[PDB]
Amino acid sequence: DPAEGLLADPYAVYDRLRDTAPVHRIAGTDGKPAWLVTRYDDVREGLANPLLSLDKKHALPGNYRGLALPPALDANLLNMDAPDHTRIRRLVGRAFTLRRVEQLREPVRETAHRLLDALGTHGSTDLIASYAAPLPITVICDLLGVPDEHRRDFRAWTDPLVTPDPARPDVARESVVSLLGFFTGLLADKRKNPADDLLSDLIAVQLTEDELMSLAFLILFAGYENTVHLIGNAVLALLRHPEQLAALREDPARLPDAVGEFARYEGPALLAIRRFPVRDVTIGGVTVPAGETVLLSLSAANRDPSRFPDPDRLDLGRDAAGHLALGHGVHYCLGAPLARLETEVALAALLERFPDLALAETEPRRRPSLRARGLLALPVTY
Ligand code: HEM
Numbered sequence: 430d431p432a433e434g435l436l437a438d439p440y441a442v443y444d445r446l447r448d449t450a451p452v453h454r455i456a457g458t459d460g461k462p463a464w465l466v467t468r469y470d471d472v473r474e475g476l477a478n479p480l481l482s483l484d485k486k487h488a489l490p491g492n493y494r495g496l497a498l499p500p501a502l503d504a505n506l507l508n509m510d511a512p513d514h515t516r517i518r519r520l521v522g523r524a525f526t527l528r529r530v531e532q533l534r535e536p537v538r539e540t541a542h543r544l545l546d547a548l549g550t551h552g553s554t555d556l557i558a559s560y561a562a563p564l565p566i567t568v569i570c571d572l573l574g575v576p577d578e579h580r581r582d583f584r585a586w587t588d589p590l591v592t593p594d595p596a597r598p599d600v601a602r603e604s605v606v607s608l609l610g611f612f613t614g615l616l617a618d619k620r621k622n623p624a625d626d627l628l629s630d631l632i633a634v635q636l637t638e639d640e641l642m643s644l645a646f647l648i649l650f651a652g653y654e655n656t657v658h659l660i661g662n663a664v665l666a667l668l669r670h671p672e673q674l675a676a677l678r679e680d681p682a683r684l685p686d687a688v689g690e691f692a693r694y695e696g697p698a699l700l701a702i703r704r705f706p707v708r709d710v711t712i713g714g715v716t717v718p719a720g721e722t723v724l725l726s727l728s729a730a731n732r733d734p735s736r737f738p739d740p741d742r743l744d745l746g747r748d749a750a751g752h753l754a755l756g757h758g759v760h761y762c763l764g765a766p767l768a769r770l771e772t773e774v775a776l777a778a779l780l781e782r783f784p785d786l787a788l789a790e791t792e793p794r795r796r797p798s799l800r801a802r803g804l805l806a807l808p809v810t811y
Pocket residue numbers: 476506507518647648651652653655656659692696697698701702703727753754755756757759760761762763764765767768
C-alpha cells in the first residue's frame with residue numbers, strides 16, 4: 430500500500446502519494462474504505478465541487494458509519510447541501526462578520542491575559558492544558574451565552590468528546606446526552622429571557638428547534654479542537670524556528686499576516702469533512718464511484734510543492750494566500766475571522782508576557798490521528 434505509515438508520518442506519506450497515488454483507496458480507522466486526495470488542485474476543486482455532497486443520505490447504503498448522534502444533530506451545516514445549507518449558513522453568518530467578531534477583541538484579550546496571570550513570571554507549563562485549550566472554550570461560552578455557574582459542568586462534558594477514548598466510550602455517550610439536556614434548557618431560558626448573546630440572536634429568527642440545537646453543538650465542536658491546535662501548533666512551530674520567533678517578537682504588527690502561514694504549515698485539520706459523490710466523479714484522472722467516501726487532505730494540499738515551493742519551510746514572508754486550512758467554497762469555515770482573532774490575540778499575549786519562552790523537551794508529543802494534527806502536551810519553560 431503506498432499509504433503505509435500514514436498515521437506515523439502523514440507529510441512523508443502525502444509526498445509519496447501525490448507522485449504515485451494522488452486519489453488512493455485506503456482503509457480508515459474503522460476499516461471502511463475511503464478515497465484519500467493529496468494534490469492541491471484536486472483538493473481545492475473537490476472542496477468547491479457541488480457533486481461532492483456533505484449529506485450522508487448520499488452515502489452508499491452499508492458503506493459509511495461515522496459517529497453516533499441523536500438525529501436532531503444530523504441537521505448540522507457539515508452534513509448538509511443547498512438549499513438547506515444555503516438557508517441556515519446565511520442566518521448564522523450574521524454572527525461572524527469581520528465587525529461582529531472585532532467587538533469580541535477586548536474580551537478575548539482579557540481571557541488570554543487572565544490565563545497567563547496564573548503562570549507567574551518564571552517556571553514550566555503544559556501550554557495546551559494552561560492556555561491553548563481553556564481560551565477557545567471560554568470564548569465559545571461567552572459567544573453562546575453559557576452562564577458562568579455552568580462552565581465547570583460544560584468543560585467536564587466537552588473534554589471527553591474531543592478525541593473520545595475508543596476503548597472507554599461511556600463517558601463520551603453520557604457527555605452528548607448531558608450537553609443535549611443542557612442546551613435544551615439554555616435555549617428555553619433565552620426564549621423566556623433574551624440576553625446579549627449568539628443563542629438569543631438565533632432564537633429570534635427561529636430555524637427549526639433541531640437546527641438551533643445543531644448550531645449550538647457544531648459551533649462548540651468546530652470552534653474548539655481546531656482553535657486549540659492551531660494555537661498550540663503555531664507556538665511549537667515558532668519555538669522550532671528561532672529566526673521566525675525573533676521576527677515576530679521584534680515586529681508584533683506582523684502577527685495577523687503570519688496566521689496564514691501557521692495554518693498552511695501546521696493547520697489542525699489534516700482532512701476535510703468526508704464527502705460523497707452524488708454521481709460518479711473523476712478526480713485527477715480517477716473515477717470515484719457515486720456514494721463512496723472521499724477524504725480531501727487539506728494538509729496534503731497545503732504542502733503540495735507544485736503550489737507552495739519549499740512546502741516544509743515555515744516562511745512568514747510567504748504568500749500563504751490560497752491555503753485550504755479553513756476550507757474553500759460554500760462550507761468555508763464560518764468561524765474564520767474569530768479563529769484568526771483568537772490566534773493573533775493568544776500568540777501576541779504569550780510572546781509579550783514570556784520573553785524567555787522555550788521548549789522543555791527535544792521532541793513534540795503528537796496525537797496519532799488520520800484527521801487531526803495536534804499535541805497531547807506542549808511543555809515549555811519561561
Ligand atoms: C472560533 C473558531 C471556529 C468556529 C466557531 C468554527 C466554525 C465552523 C463551522 C460552523 C464550520 C461549518 C461551516 C459550513 O459547513 O457551512 C466550519 C468549517 C470549517 N472550519 Fe471552522 N471554526 C473555527 C475555527 C477553525 C479553525 C482554527 C480551523 C482550522 C485552522 C477551522 C477549519 C475549518 C474547516 C477546514 C472547515 C471546512 C470543512 C469542510 O469543508 O470539510 N475552523 N467551522
